[PDB]
Design a protein around this ligand. Sequence first.
Ligand SMILES: Nc1ncnc2c1ncn2[C@H]1C[C@H](O)[C@@H](COP(=O)(O)OP(=O)(O)OP(=O)(O)O)O1
Ligand SMILES: [Ca+2]
Ligand SMILES: [Ca+2]
Ligand SMILES: [Ca+2]
Length: 341
Amino acid sequence: MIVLFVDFDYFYAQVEEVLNPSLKGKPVVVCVFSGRFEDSGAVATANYEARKFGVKAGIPIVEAKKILPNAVYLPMRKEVYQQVSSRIMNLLREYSEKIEIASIDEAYLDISDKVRDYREAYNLGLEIKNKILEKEKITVTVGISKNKVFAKIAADMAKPNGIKVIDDEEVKRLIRELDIADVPGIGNITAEKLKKLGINKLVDTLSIEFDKLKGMIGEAKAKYLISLARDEYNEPIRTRVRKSIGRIVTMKRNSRNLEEIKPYLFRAIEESYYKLDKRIPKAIHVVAVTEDLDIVSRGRTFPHGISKETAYSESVKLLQKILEEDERKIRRIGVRFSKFI
DNA sequence: CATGAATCCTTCCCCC
DNA sequence: GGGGGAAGGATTC
Ligand SMILES: Nc1ncnc2c1ncn2[C@H]1C[C@H](O)[C@@H](COP(=O)(O)OP(=O)(O)OP(=O)(O)O)O1
Ligand SMILES: [Ca+2]
Ligand SMILES: [Ca+2]
Ligand SMILES: [Ca+2]
């Protein structure tokens, strides 16, 4: 089997260059302003020019300005990136339609039925890198190997504007050499639990006996890692259906007064219904972020679908529920609809 | 100073 | 005991 993985580069920023190419050559930061104070918020992505000087995702806008005060700071326009992505996805559809859309930025492709070997795949790689570049002026990175995981790894190695192959062999070394934290699905929290078990490398998994492993990470995380290191990981590609929709918004100031908060919440809902389009949810959660960045949620599943009118009233019941249980102030509030039909 | 969602986990609860 | 399913939270990207 041959999987081809595609990650678009500094994607929001890149789209921003493509739309105003005067930007090409300057450091660019797409960021998301909360508006509690002037230039509050966080960086979403930045082009490589900016990333050189340590300006990347997650970091606060304030601290990006301490480094690169003469850079360009644009508000995120997600909906645009969304359409552009969609276009790009349709180019790939007609290169193979055994296709998994991971994120806005990433997709996998079975091309067993189109290529025979890693040579002629690479070719498919470049045809695509190119097709996309010509059609949309977008640089991407392409990774290829025998399954989804190693494809994704291939790309991470090759970033940016790269293309890389990890043949049925070189897996070998990675299973021995490659750091466990650079494995997809292993964030800091999980990585540190494994370092704490003397597993800094994908092969160490077999030394330990499963049941201790399972207890500390989880059955599926364990199985996942074991199959990788053992080499039987061969999860397929498929199309993936959206199961959940919802927005979550930041308030002017932390609060526990219901009347101050409800408006913010009614924005989240209406946006969510606009976004729902034709589909109808049976479940609704309300979600609050505390002043010290903790998340609580309360929800409810209905035996039937949910009208706009219902959602409005039911959400108030849940925020009321959140308020008398958790005593902290609320920083951000919002909703999430689940369980369509 | 810190801005959408899938998947997994753990804890209940109902019940046969 | 174990199936079936909900809630709330944990974790990843
Ligand atoms: N930590 C984050 N905070 C906010 N937005 C993010 C974050 N990670 C990713 N995104 C959004 C913005 C990105 O343009 C897009 C895809 O992310 P990702 O592939 O991780 O990096 P990137 O597309 O910015 O550049 P690159 O892939 O070259 O690092 O999703
Ligand atoms: Ca990317
Ligand atoms: Ca990691
Ligand atoms: Ca990503």
